[PDB]
């Protein structure tokens, strides 16, 4: 059946511009619109507009018509009613601003053939994340957490580790150097000032399992080629390494 | 303008129960209304293409109904893969409006969070900084509360928050906050704690620590 | 660049003297300008500066 | 004859009818009435769909 594929997910400086690119394939019909939507990084789901690629005609939501240009690769070949067809579509987001940070979807739209009418959106693209800040590419700060002056005993026990100061979100974080994945937990993301990322990672166990194994945490960050493998032992006053 | 609304912001149900998601619009849209599903982190999926009419590849559990201002999606025998976000959308007007989005979540018995708090390690402090981190962990419902004690006084305008989503095995949930300081204020303040509250707790299960001990 | 005439004022067609939003402010000034420009190799650029793609409500 | 028309939100409808001799020139050597699902290709011209 039909699919939409849309290429690249990005971060760019405020006042610069992007052109999120879509390709549509495998449908039986020849007159659909390709229509653009955004999902806000908190909550909400916004109508932007669409194009009908056989005509190159475009129209917009009244809250976007100043900022963005929707456009397409033109035309269609045939009246044959069963042979292949494909289309490509774009949103030119000029002059990026902080709140333009979102996931953008293309979707196949039947408005030009449900008679001529407004419509639901029938098939959706991969969803491409776009982000806006004046910050720069960097590797993480990678600090361990540890025990401090407390009974350090009874019920649930844990040690944990922290990651911060990295740019773009794809850190890969894991425990035990590729072992014992049960009882692992993460607080996947939050944004620190100017848009640098932070993550908290833990393993949680019964009381007697705290002082009794090599706890090792693994951190890697593809956008900076950074790698860190290290232990998470007591470090408050009872300075410990084994 | 057409305002679109969904009745619960989130609702929780057992697998094999019947869901009854319900929508209201400002003045009649009169059909021309869709519903969608969104698996976490995935693109949306269409459920119904008009108020009474089911989409392609929808496995009979689902139905639509509605008229004028009032609309609903019913799910019969809600499966462990049907736990997702759900949206209405009108297409009766040139502003094509999606509803606010309703999560459906796996019902459970109440459980209280076990508690943790942690210090800065030496590398933060050699870098001129300190951060104090807490957990309210492995609990239900998703509805605990946190704030920060420093020299036993409340201060929290520095702080961040984050959560771990529902355990796919267990529905259980987790919450964290971080307090943060420059090295000079970390040396000033002598004791730190995270205050604790939950729907299943009568009083804080507070834990505390002293600076550099 | 290409140059055109308003009345007493000659201007660059990339930044005509009315800018921004000429037809949103002043349709009749746009008429009075365009009446003598119907015959210049910058006509479409002046259309693109005065009323097509140039006007907006959202900050660009 | 050629006629074009529409309808108001008011349900009132309008039309305009001209005299007009519509008869397409023949392409090739056969005066066929609808495109065939087998045949050959010949060059012609068309008002293309682009609104550019």
* Alpha carbon distance A189, A101 (integer Å): 15
Q: CB–CB of C58 and A95 under 8 A?
A: no
Q: Residue C56: closest CA among chain A residues belongs to which residue?
A: A66
Contact in structure between B165 and B171 (CB atoms under 8 Å): no
Answer whether A35's CB lies under 8 Å from A102's CB: no
CA distance A123 to chain D (A): 25
CB contact under 8 A, D50 and A75: yes
As a whole number of Å, the end-to-end CA separation of chain B is 60
Helix crossing, C43-50 with C27-34: angle to 10°? 170
Query: Which residues in chain C are contacts of A63 at CB distance < 8 A?
Result: 58
Dihedral angle sign, alpha carbons of residues C29, C30, C36, C41:
positive
Structure token pair of residue A119: 């419509």
CA atoms of B159 and B180, how far apart (whole Å): 6
Whether residue B49 lies within 8 A of chain A, CB to CB, comes out as yes
CA A48 from chain centre, in angstroms, equals 20
Q: Distance from D9 to chain A by nearest Cα, in Å?
A: 15
D50 Cβ under 8 Å from any chain A Cβ: yes
Q: Tell me, yes or no, if B160 comes closer than 8 A to chain A by beta carbon.
A: yes
Beta carbons within 10 angstroms of residue B58's beta carbon: 15
B48 close to B74: Cβ distance less than 8 angstroms: no
Q: CA-CA distance, A78 to A216, in Å (whole number)?
A: 62
In 3-state terms, what secondary structure has residue A222?
A: helix
Q: Which residue from A55, A76, A79 is facing D51, i.e. has the nearest CB?
A: A55
Q: List chains adjacent to chain A, taking adjacency as at least 3 C-beta pairs closer than 8 Å.
A: B, C, D
Method: cryo-EM
- Nearest-CA residue of chain A relative to D38? A80
Question: How far is residue B115's CA from residue B94's CA, in Å, rounded to a whole number?
Answer: 51
Q: Which residues of A touch D48 (CB under 8 A)?
A: 75
Inter-chain CB proximity D51 and A79 less than 8 Å? no
Yes or no, beta carbons of A120 and B34 under 8 Å apart: yes
**Residue A228 corresponds to which tokens in the numbers above?**
């860190």
**CA C43 – CA A118 distance, rounded (Å):** 36
Closest among B143, B120, B127, B146 to B206, alpha carbons compared:
B146
**Neighbour subunits, C (≥3 Cβ pairs < 8 A):** A
Helix (H) or strand (E) holding C48: helix C43-50
Residue of B nearest to A188 (CA): B164
Is D42 near chain A, with CB under 8 Å? no
Which whole-number Å values give the CA distances from B189 to B124, B130, B155, B211, in the listed order?
Answer: 16, 11, 11, 7
Measured in angstroms, the CA of A69 and the nearest CA of chain C are apart by: 9
Q: Rounded CA gap, C39 and C4, in Å?
A: 10
Q: Report the alpha-carbon distance of residue A20 to residue C34 in Å, rounded.
A: 37
Rounded Cα distance, C54 and A194, in Å: 32
Measured between beta carbons, the chain D residues lying within 8 angstroms of A116 are none
Strands A3-7, A10-12: pairing kind: unpaired
Residues 129-188 of A with CB under 8 A from B: 141, 143-146, 148-150, 155-156, 158, 160, 162, 185-188
Q: Is the Cβ pair B121, A144 closer than 8 Å? A: yes
* Residues across chain A: 242
Strands B33-38 and B85-90: antiparallel
User: How many alpha carbons lie under 13 Å from residue A105 in its C-beta half-sphere?
Assistant: 22
Query: How far is it, in rounded angstroms, from Cα A192 to Cα A189?
Result: 10
| Chains A and B are touching, with contact defined as 3 or more CB–CB pairs separated by less than 8 Å | yes
DSSP state of B183: H
| Pairwise CB contact (< 8 Å): D50 & A55 | yes
């Amino acid at each position: 059946q039909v699919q939409l594929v849309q290429s690249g997910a990005e971060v760019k400086k405020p006042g610069s511009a992007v052109k999120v690119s879509c390709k549509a394939s495998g449908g039986t019909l020849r007159k659909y619109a390709i229509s653009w939507l955004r999902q806000a990084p908190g909550q909400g789901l916004e109508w932007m507009g669409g194009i009908i690629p056989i005509f190159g005609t475009a129209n917009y939501a009244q809250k976007f018509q100043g900022r963005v240009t929707i456009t397409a690769d033109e035309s269609t070949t045939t009246p044959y009613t069963t042979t292949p067809y494909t289309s490509t579509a774009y949103i030119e987001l000029t002059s990026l601003r902080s709140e333009d940070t979102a996931v953008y979807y293309c979707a196949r739209d039947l408005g030009p053939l449900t008679g001529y009418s407004y419509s639901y959106f029938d098939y959706w693209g991969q969803g491409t994340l776009v982000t806006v800040s004046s910050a720069s590419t960097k590797g993480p700060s990678v600090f361990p957490l540890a025990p401090s002056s407390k009974s350090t005993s009874g019920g649930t026990a844990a040690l944990g580790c922290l990651v911060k100061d990295y740019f773009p979100e794809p850190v890969t974080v894991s425990w035990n150097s590729g072992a014992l994945t049960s009882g692992v937990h993460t607080f996947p993301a939050v944004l620190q000032s100017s848009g640098l990322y932070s993550l908290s990672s833990v393993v949680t166990v019964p009381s007697s399992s705290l002082g009794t194994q090599t706890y090792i945490c693994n951190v890697n960050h593809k956008p900076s080629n950074t790698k860190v493998d290290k232990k998470v032992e007591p470090k408050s006053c009872d300075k410990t390494h084994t | 303008e057409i305002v679109m609304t969904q009745s619960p912001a989130t609702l929780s149900l057992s697998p094999g129960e019947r869901a009854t998601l319900s929508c209201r619009a400002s003045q009649s849209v009169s059909s021309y209304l869709a519903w969608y599903q969104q698996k976490p982190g995935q693109a949306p999926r269409l459920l119904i293409y008009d108020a009474s009419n089911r989409a392609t590849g929808i496995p009979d559990r689902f139905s639509g109904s509605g008229s004028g201002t009032d609309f609903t999606l019913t799910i019969s025998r809600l499966e462990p893969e049907d736990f997702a976000v759900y949206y209405c959308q009108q297409y009766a007007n040139s502003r094509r409006t999606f509803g606010q989005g309703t999560k459906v979540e796996i019902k459970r018995t109440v459980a209280a969070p076990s508690v943790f708090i942690f210090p800065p390690s030496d590398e933060q402090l050699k870098s001129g900084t300190a951060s104090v981190v807490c957990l309210l962990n492995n609990f239900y419902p998703r509805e605990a509360k946190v704030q920060w004690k420093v020299d036993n006084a409340l201060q929290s305008g520095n702080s961040q928050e984050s959560v771990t989503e529902q355990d796919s095995k267990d529905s259980t949930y987790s919450l964290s906050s971080t307090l943060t300081l420059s090295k000079a204020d970390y040396e000033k303040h002598k004791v730190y704690a995270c205050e604790v509250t939950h729907q299943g707790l009568s009083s804080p299960v507070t834990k505390s620590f002293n600076r550099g001990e | 660049p290409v140059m055109c005439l308003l009345a007493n004022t000659t201007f660059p067609c990339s930044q005509p003297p009315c800018t921004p939003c000429c037809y949103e402010k002043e349709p009749e000034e746009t008429l009075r300008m365009l009446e003598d420009n119907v015959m210049r190799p910058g006509y479409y650029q002046l259309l693109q500066a005065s009323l097509t793609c140039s006007p907006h409500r959202q900050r660009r | 004859t050629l006629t074009v028309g529409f309808t108001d939100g008011r349900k009132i409808s309008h039309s305009c009818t001209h005299p007009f001799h519509h008869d397409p020139p023949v392409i090739g050597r056969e005066k066929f009435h609808s495109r065939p699902q087998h045949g050959r290709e010949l060059p012609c011209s068309t008002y293309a769909q682009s609104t550019a």
